Design a protein around this ligand. Structure first.
Ligand SMILES: *[C@@H]1O[C@H](CO)[C@@H](O[C@@H]2O[C@H](CO)[C@@H](O[C@@H]3O[C@H](CO)[C@@H](O)[C@H](O[C@H]4O[C@H](CO)[C@@H](O)[C@H](O)[C@@H]4O)[C@@H]3O)[C@H](O)[C@H]2NC(C)=O)[C@H](O)[C@H]1NC(C)=O
Ligand SMILES: *[C@@H]1O[C@H](CO)[C@@H](O[C@@H]2O[C@H](CO)[C@@H](O[C@@H]3O[C@H](CO)[C@@H](O)[C@H](O[C@H]4O[C@H](CO)[C@@H](O)[C@H](O)[C@@H]4O)[C@@H]3O)[C@H](O)[C@H]2NC(C)=O)[C@H](O)[C@H]1NC(C)=O
Ligand SMILES: *[C@@H]1O[C@H](CO)[C@@H](O[C@@H]2O[C@H](CO)[C@@H](O)[C@H](O)[C@H]2NC(C)=O)[C@H](O)[C@H]1NC(C)=O
Ligand SMILES: *[C@@H]1O[C@H](CO)[C@@H](O[C@@H]2O[C@H](CO)[C@@H](O)[C@H](O)[C@H]2NC(C)=O)[C@H](O)[C@H]1NC(C)=O
Ligand SMILES: *[C@@H]1O[C@H](CO)[C@@H](O[C@@H]2O[C@H](CO)[C@@H](O)[C@H](O)[C@H]2NC(C)=O)[C@H](O)[C@H]1NC(C)=O
Ligand SMILES: *[C@@H]1O[C@H](CO)[C@@H](O[C@@H]2O[C@H](CO)[C@@H](O)[C@H](O)[C@H]2NC(C)=O)[C@H](O)[C@H]1NC(C)=O
Ligand SMILES: *[C@@H]1O[C@H](CO)[C@@H](O[C@@H]2O[C@H](CO)[C@@H](O)[C@H](O)[C@H]2NC(C)=O)[C@H](O)[C@H]1NC(C)=O
Ligand SMILES: *[C@@H]1O[C@H](CO)[C@@H](O[C@@H]2O[C@H](CO)[C@@H](O)[C@H](O)[C@H]2NC(C)=O)[C@H](O)[C@H]1NC(C)=O
Ligand SMILES: *[C@@H]1O[C@H](CO)[C@@H](O[C@@H]2O[C@H](CO)[C@@H](O)[C@H](O)[C@H]2NC(C)=O)[C@H](O)[C@H]1NC(C)=O
Ligand SMILES: *[C@@H]1O[C@H](CO)[C@@H](O[C@@H]2O[C@H](CO)[C@@H](O)[C@H](O)[C@H]2NC(C)=O)[C@H](O)[C@H]1NC(C)=O
Ligand SMILES: *[C@@H]1O[C@H](CO)[C@@H](O)[C@H](O)[C@H]1NC(C)=O
Ligand SMILES: *[C@@H]1O[C@H](CO)[C@@H](O)[C@H](O)[C@H]1NC(C)=O
Ligand SMILES: *[C@@H]1O[C@H](CO)[C@@H](O)[C@H](O)[C@H]1NC(C)=O
Ligand SMILES: *[C@@H]1O[C@H](CO)[C@@H](O)[C@H](O)[C@H]1NC(C)=O
Ligand SMILES: *[C@@H]1O[C@H](CO)[C@@H](O)[C@H](O)[C@H]1NC(C)=O
Ligand SMILES: *[C@@H]1O[C@H](CO)[C@@H](O)[C@H](O)[C@H]1NC(C)=O
Ligand SMILES: *[C@@H]1O[C@H](CO)[C@@H](O)[C@H](O)[C@H]1NC(C)=O
Ligand SMILES: *[C@@H]1O[C@H](CO)[C@@H](O)[C@H](O)[C@H]1NC(C)=O
Ligand SMILES: *[C@@H]1O[C@H](CO)[C@@H](O)[C@H](O)[C@H]1NC(C)=O
Ligand SMILES: *[C@@H]1O[C@H](CO)[C@@H](O)[C@H](O)[C@H]1NC(C)=O
Ligand SMILES: *[C@@H]1O[C@H](CO)[C@@H](O)[C@H](O)[C@H]1NC(C)=O
Ligand SMILES: *[C@@H]1O[C@H](CO)[C@@H](O)[C@H](O)[C@H]1NC(C)=O
Ligand SMILES: *[C@@H]1O[C@H](CO)[C@@H](O)[C@H](O)[C@H]1NC(C)=O
Ligand SMILES: *[C@@H]1O[C@H](CO)[C@@H](O)[C@H](O)[C@H]1NC(C)=O
Ligand SMILES: *[C@@H]1O[C@H](CO)[C@@H](O)[C@H](O)[C@H]1NC(C)=O
Ligand SMILES: *[C@@H]1O[C@H](CO)[C@@H](O)[C@H](O)[C@H]1NC(C)=O
Ligand SMILES: *[C@@H]1O[C@H](CO)[C@@H](O)[C@H](O)[C@H]1NC(C)=O
Ligand SMILES: *[C@@H]1O[C@H](CO)[C@@H](O)[C@H](O)[C@H]1NC(C)=O
Ligand SMILES: *[C@@H]1O[C@H](CO)[C@@H](O)[C@H](O)[C@H]1NC(C)=O
Lengths: 125, 104, 451, 125, 125, 451
């Protein structure tokens, strides 16, 4: 299970987007016993929060998930080759760290509830 | 306190028939707070009804009561021989005068 | 026509009972090495807390059936217990005490309260012993025998063993906020005239309750919240005399309390690492502890309370205030602790008024060191003496009263101060809070059909 | 995150069906430490039970989910405007509380396992 | 909830494939309090691991899930009637226990990430 | 042709070891303030429990490798330990005892069992002492010196310190049900002739085990379950003599036990909050404790056991019952506790029979107050005396036996009562239970293909 963990952290973003299962499988597992239980419970809560974020974006059971949210060049004006063939996910996260919540709020409530209401109203037809 | 009038002063019946003892509260606001106590001669009182209508644990079903507001009543369905005593109505700390059920 | 549609995240709730977790200021934790009511069992609070107004929502509240009060009781008692486990236990001090009167500089009121008592005590070495003297209060010592041998024993020693509070641990109530875990909400009644029961048309949801200071007191609620508009009278049943009446003031009454004696603290070694702190010698004159309240302020608040009581007992009823009929010292006097010293004030001056339908007061207070908290028999604590003169300012924000029964005449109603159970002291702050369970799954009819 | 929590509890059911993410994001987070750990673990178990109920209805990753279960007028004979434009979800839950398990058993086993077997047998074609 | 639990453990595999919800609903719930908390937390972690395995196979919210992985006769050369009308799931698990990880690795990484990349590249068109 | 299809929720399981949680009646918890075997660590039970018959399922059981028995052992010992932590520790009582015979009203059998013993004792005040007398049993006191000074010491005092059971805590075994957490199941063998090992063709799954009373006893299983059809003989290896044989009766033998002495309880203060309860004075005549069993019922059950033993040791073998070869008092006698008093009965009358291939019995019992439970050296407890005459009724539902080895002649087999380890007492109730892990993920071939 642990084999290959984080091994594409120095690879390009595209090369590292082909090992997502390796890092997804490694996210789940006296006074010492309660400290370790608190660590395990926090890991569980953290996994559940991430999966809830995926589920409120229409991205459940998906390691790669496309959306209807346009990319803003204000967030990043780099070209596709620069990002996917000339950058790592760590550098990317450093670059977009101050824009993450804007994207997460454009995915959270606008796109998904709009799309979901439209599917309900199309299912009416 | 709350005045309680428990009429009639003396009620003369015979076994097996239904008696309807009544208590009327005067200086109250009106609620379901009443209790009915049975006191045989030479014995301390015993709780029959705890509430406007509910029954104390262990008391047979022949003893039943009802009421609300400022008028309540005890209904002994079957006047068995072990059912003749003095009956009292209680509204918080106040007590009734007492109703005698005597054989006749 | 219509089909089942499943909705997740619907704003539906039910009444529930959960285990709440506190929130406290990290700031005060840096200022407070330790406080009996631990900020370590609790969590640092979140700045800028959120309160969302639930417009158009009317919720049923019951101040008298609230599990937040019971959890607070359990938490405060347990925090006290664990704060007193590490500290020294004064079992070696259960010895015969030869006691004599202290008459160095004594006023006629303070005659006999303090006694000079000598006794044999253990030392750090197990093979040697020492004779040591300490001053003790009359309320903390009992005659061993009827005959006037002047031999005395500590009151607890027969029934139990008395722990000593650690000198470093502080007693100042710091605010604690009670927060709800995930999937639970705290609904706050924003109605200004609510009596703690019935529907509340103005409701809000809060992450945590406001800061509540665990103030332990009888006959008077100190350093609490205040009514926004009018004095608030809250009883489970006002007609019932067996239920205490909780009064909330809209304007506080300032109370100034003092023990004018200049006290000293004497370290006595009773073991290898165990110390016993004693009253030492009182520098200067000895005068009784007392509390001052403004007389005009007290009278105006009493008139306001009388008006609210008349709203429940008749417009021409006579509202009489009288003092405690009896009981333990805690309930008969206004018991409180401020600065680490435990006071016991005679409030006969406070409740000495008949109100017909139409300058300061000084309360003689007494001090104790053996304290039985929370109406428990067998778990006394020794309060170490506090060095210096203590001056103390507090707000009287409410009362705890009991109405006399068996009234032969119906034109008068007598109310006497009461207390002793702190569940009726902490329910005067949590009266407007109820915990609810969120039920986020809903099913409703729609015309939409799964393909 | 907490902003807007339960703020549509006095709004109509339709108006309150547009804030579901606000209430979905607020469902996940010594002797005192074990009491709080038990509270957190029960919150996790409760969220997992709700998500399992959604998943056995074909409603995973969905805040609004349509089904193939007809509404019975015995459950409620009210008209759509009454429910969605003239009632709150609290009143609705009060009305349907004694019918919830019937609906949940018509979603649990009939609709989903029937539909799922039919998708398997259509995937055979 | 507990009613019918494991009641198709002596039934044929097909007959037992119609009661999966009964066994899915029964997988979720001082020093004694921490021991029981550790048991409950391990049950939660175990359920989450199983659901993560389902989700990395494109099988989220699904009790029956078809895949694009051919069956190898080396794993089992039995005919469909033998398996589904003449065997129980316990005997099946005994037979395939030494082949489970091969199937799980053919579902884990090959099929799902291949399919998922192809859906992304088709969504590009 | 065929493709992988993933199935979740398949009825597949494997053998596993988990931490089970009890279930108990809330009712009895309201009736029982406290019981050594805590109903607080455990949970209220669910009315109308479910048992689903696993038709066509045959499961392998091993009575002799079951972790439910080990968990029960750990839980019962730990519950005892925590029930005895708060209670008083009788370290001040380790003093020289001047003991003399009690001959007020004594039968020839009870001669010397009880002794009148005087000793100096601590009082609540640390500076004063008292001389107090108590009656002690010969088994709880040991001569300090060989010379006849009549000086005595409590048996534990050299090696360990002896705790005192709290007088309020009760000793009555209440049933506890062992339940499995989520993702685990308890499989119950419903075969009526099962010997605890091998395949079980009739299996059911249960939420919780039946109520099992933690009855602590040696040589005889009391208040247990009974065989449905025939007497059941269960040994790990019947040929091996080092493994105890567990016998289950299909019909119980009623046993009536009594201590006819009218006992009293004397409170002695040994500390500020610590009390020591003593035997006081026995009102009236003193007679030995004893137990009665029906002789005809015992003989018929022994014949049934002999028949089952013949099914394992030959059809013409002589089955002889004899009494314990030796060991501690617990194993040599039928040890049990009923009412809070710990009995020790000589079962030589019970096992006094030779069975060739073709009115009541009275057992003289003895009483003790220093009890070393569960074969542990160093953790003795003092049982406070029980006031009044105790009468006691129990069902003998089984036996624990050991077969004698080294038999020179092969026509006879001798079986002697045994015990001491309660893992063989609690394994006679959990013999039909095994915990399993559910494996809900399955992969099977189908012709269906993902689009
Ligand atoms: C109601 O609220 C009022 C106002 O908050 C409160 O009075 C305050 O109490 C505190 C704590 O008793 C007082 O502070 C003490 O007084 C001085 C001022 O700094 C210091 O000498 C004290 O520090 C000593 O004690 C500490 C241990 O507690 C040690 O850590 C320290 O080293 C010192 O030895 C201490 O801070 C404060 O002065 C008053 N304020 C007023 C205006 O009276 C009152 O107690 C509350 N009432 C009740 C009943 O709870
Ligand atoms: C096998 O099962 C039998 C039947 O269940 C069991 O015998 C019963 O034991 C109980 C408990 O020892 C007996 O009840 C006691 O006896 C009387 C009857 O009410 C009371 O005096 C006792 O109460 C006193 O003690 C309590 C503390 O235990 C105090 O709380 C209380 O205030 C009293 O001081 C107590 O209830 C019961 O009478 C017998 N029943 C029969 C038919 O003998 C037996 O003990 C079990 N055997 C074994 C070996 O476990
Ligand atoms: C309490 O009595 C003690 C005697 O035990 C007093 O202590 C003595 O005080 C005198 C001064 O009058 C000193 O010379 C002695 O040395 C003290 N005794 C010892 C043993 O050192 C003490 O003054 C009294 N305290 C009060 C407050 O009256
Ligand atoms: C608090 O206010 C409520 C609402 O005014 C009071 O409830 C009324 O009184 C009784 C209960 O005592 C009930 O009949 C109803 O719930 C209310 N009646 C109405 C609105 O007609 C409640 O009594 C008040 N309590 C106090 C102590 O003042
Ligand atoms: C409480 O009130 C009393 C009575 O007014 C105050 O006692 C006076 O205090 C002042 C200031 O120290 C002295 O100059 C007076 O001589 C005192 N008057 C008396 C005893 O009649 C006392 O200070 C007040 N205590 C407080 C506010 O703690
Ligand atoms: C309580 O009030 C009574 C009067 O109702 C006080 O007693 C009177 O006090 C005044 C003023 O000191 C005296 O002139 C009277 O002679 C007192 N007796 C009577 C019968 O009026 C009493 O002092 C008050 N108690 C307090 C403040 O504790
Ligand atoms: C055990 O011996 C003690 C002596 O220590 C006896 O107690 C004395 O009994 C006599 C009556 O014979 C009383 O007058 C004395 O007061 C008792 N002694 C004390 C110190 O009070 C006791 O009777 C003996 N017990 C038995 C069972 O024989
Ligand atoms: C319990 O019954 C089983 C089944 O009858 C016995 O198992 C047989 O005996 C031995 C093990 O002792 C093994 O060869 C087989 O497992 C079984 N053999 C068969 C069916 O031919 C088991 O011995 C019995 N145990 C006791 C104590 O009677
Ligand atoms: C156990 O059996 C003995 C012997 O039968 C019983 O002792 C008899 O008890 C009765 C009733 O109290 C007495 O009248 C007899 O005198 C006793 N007979 C003797 C000593 O020979 C004893 O009661 C039984 N104990 C029980 C059932 O607890
Ligand atoms: C065990 O059995 C033996 C006999 O096998 C008993 O001893 C005999 O008891 C009878 C009846 O009391 C006497 O007549 C005999 O003289 C005894 N001796 C022999 C050699 O038979 C013995 O009492 C029994 N033991 C018990 C009940 O503990
Ligand atoms: C590291 O970078 C080199 C060239 O920059 C590349 O060939 C190699 O694959 C990279 N390795 C990893 C593990 O990213
Ligand atoms: C991109 O972000 C800017 C702010 O930096 C905002 O004004 C603009 O509207 C955004 N563009 C889109 C398409 O949302
Ligand atoms: C993102 O992070 C910092 C911190 O706010 C921000 O000031 C900065 O402009 C951003 N950095 C980059 C490299 O874009
Ligand atoms: C202290 O001990 C002495 C002898 O060391 C003794 O005479 C005196 O009475 C004791 N004092 C007490 C108990 O106060
Ligand atoms: C006392 O009341 C005043 C006036 O409301 C307030 O400002 C002050 O903070 C209060 N003090 C305490 C200690 O509660
Ligand atoms: C109390 O005594 C100390 C001891 O030095 C002194 O500094 C202080 O001024 C005294 N205070 C009063 C109010 O007398
Ligand atoms: C109450 O006041 C009376 C005088 O009216 C007094 O004698 C009595 O001691 C007071 N009681 C208490 C408990 O303070
Ligand atoms: C308080 O006002 C009331 C008015 O009835 C009356 O008892 C008295 O004049 C006032 N008392 C004081 C002490 O100011
Ligand atoms: C409350 O109701 C009023 C009218 O009934 C409506 O205008 C308003 O939007 C509602 N507000 C909420 C928060 O539901
Ligand atoms: C609606 O419920 C009733 C019972 O109230 C039942 O008889 C009827 O069949 C149900 N209708 C449908 C369409 O299932
Ligand atoms: C739903 O709940 C109660 C409780 O069973 C039931 O009797 C009643 O008919 C229902 N109430 C409504 C308002 O439909
Ligand atoms: C058990 O098997 C029989 C025949 O083998 C079959 O009729 C029956 O349905 C099966 N029962 C279960 C519960 O699997
Ligand atoms: C089946 O497994 C064998 C090894 O047993 C392997 O050689 C073969 O390639 C596999 N077949 C397929 C179609 O993957
Ligand atoms: C599967 O399990 C064992 C253990 O590795 C293996 O040797 C055996 O061949 C397999 N058993 C069956 C019945 O296929
Ligand atoms: C008890 O103490 C006395 C003196 O106080 C001593 O003579 C006697 O021997 C002691 N008794 C014992 C140890 O039994
Ligand atoms: C003893 O056995 C009888 C007959 O089986 C049974 O009814 C009774 O409950 C049993 N008593 C105990 C205490 O187990
Ligand atoms: C035991 O002694 C007590 C003490 O009064 C008495 O009430 C009771 O009757 C006695 N019992 C017997 C069996 O002698
Ligand atoms: C066993 O019985 C013999 C007589 O056969 C007896 O002497 C011996 O003491 C008994 N042993 C035990 C341990 O009871
Ligand atoms: C029991 O029966 C057997 C039959 O062999 C024999 O020992 C004896 O006659 C009987 N014993 C008693 C004590 O009834």
């Amino acid at each position: 299970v642990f084999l290959g963990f984080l091994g594409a952290a120095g690879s390009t973003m595209g090369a590292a987007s082909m090992t997502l299962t390796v890092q997804a499988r490694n996210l789940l597992s006296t006074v010492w016993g309660i400290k370790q239980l608190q660590a395990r419970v926090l890991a569980v809560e953290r996994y559940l929060r991430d999966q809830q974020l995926l589920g409120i974006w229409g991205c459940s059971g998906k390691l790669i998930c496309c959306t209807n949210v346009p990319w803003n060049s204000s967030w990043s004006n780099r070209n596709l080759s620069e990002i996917w063939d000339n950058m790592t996910w760590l550098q990317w996260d450093k670059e977009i760290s101050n824009y993450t919540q804007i994207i997460y709020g454009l995915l959270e409530e606008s796109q998904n509830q709009q799309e979901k209401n439209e599917q309900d109203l199309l299912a009416l037809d | 306190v709350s005045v309680l009038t428990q009429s009639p002063g003396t009620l003369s019946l015979s076994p097996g028939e239904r008696a309807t003892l009544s208590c009327r509260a005067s200086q109250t606001v009106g609620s379901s707070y009443l209790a009915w106590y049975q006191q045989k001669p030479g014995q301390a009182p015993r709780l029959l009804i705890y509430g406007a209508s509910s029954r104390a644990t262990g008391i047979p079903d022949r003893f039943s009561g009802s009421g609300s507001g400022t008028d309540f009543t005890l209904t002994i369905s079957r006047l068995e021989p072990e059912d003749f005593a003095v009956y009292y109505c209680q509204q918080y700390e106040a007590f009734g005068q007492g109703t005698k059920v005597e054989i006749k | 026509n219509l089909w089942v549609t499943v909705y997740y995240g619907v704003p539906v709730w039910k009444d529930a009972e959960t285990t709440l977790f506190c929130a406290s200021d990290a700031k005060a934790y840096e200022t407070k090495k330790h406080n009996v009511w631990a900020t370590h069992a609790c969590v640092p609070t979140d700045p800028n807390p959120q309160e969302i107004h639930l417009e158009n929502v009317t919720e049923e509240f019951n101040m008298w059936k609230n599990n937040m009060v019971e959890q607070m009781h359990t938490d405060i008692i347990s925090l006290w217990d664990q704060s007193l486990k590490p500290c020294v236990k004064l079992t070696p001090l259960c010895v015969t005490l030869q006691c004599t009167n202290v008459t160095n500089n004594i006023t006629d009121d303070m005659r006999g309260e303090l006694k000079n008592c000598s006794f044999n005590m253990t030392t750090e070495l197990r093979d040697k012993r020492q004779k040591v003297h300490a001053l003790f209060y009359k309320l903390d010592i009992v005659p061993i025998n009827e005959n006037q041998n002047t031999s005395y024993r500590l009151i607890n020693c027969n029934t139990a063993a008395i722990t000593q509070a650690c000198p470093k641990v502080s007693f100042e109530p710091i605010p604690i906020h009670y927060c709800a875990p995930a999937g639970f909400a705290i609904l706050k009644c924003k109605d200004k005239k609510f009596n703690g029961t019935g529907p509340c048309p103005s409701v809000s949801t809060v992450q945590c309750t406001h800061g509540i200071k665990p103030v332990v007191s009888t006959q008077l609620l100190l350093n609490g919240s205040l009514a926004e508009e009018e004095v608030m009278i809250r009883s489970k049943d006002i007609r019932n005399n067996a239920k205490n009446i909780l009064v909330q003031f809209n304007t506080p009454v300032q109370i100034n309390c003092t023990r004018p004696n200049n006290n000293t603290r004497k370290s006595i070694r009773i073991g290898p690492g165990q110390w016993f702190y004693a009253t030492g010698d009182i520098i200067g004159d000895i005068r009784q502890a007392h509390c001052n309240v403004s007389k005009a302020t007290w009278n105006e608040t009493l008139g306001k309370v009388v008006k609210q009581l008349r709203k429940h007992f008749g417009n021409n009823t006579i509202i009489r205030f009288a003092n405690s009929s009896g009981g333990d010292l805690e309930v008969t006097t206004h018991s409180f602790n401020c600065g680490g010293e435990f006071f016991y004030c005679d409030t006969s001056g406070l409740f000495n008024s008949t109100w017909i339908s139409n300058d300061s007061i000084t309360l003689p207070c007494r001090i104790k060191q053996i304290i039985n908290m929370w109406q428990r028999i067998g778990q006394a604590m020794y309060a170490p003496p506090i060095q210096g003169v203590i001056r103390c300012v507090s707000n009287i924000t409410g009362l705890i009263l009991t109405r006399d029964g068996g009234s032969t005449d119906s034109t008068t109603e007598t109310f006497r101060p009461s207390g002793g159970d702190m569940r009726d002291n902490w329910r005067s702050e949590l009266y407007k809070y109820k915990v609810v369970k969120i039920e986020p799954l809903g099913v409703a009819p729609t015309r939409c059909k799964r393909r």
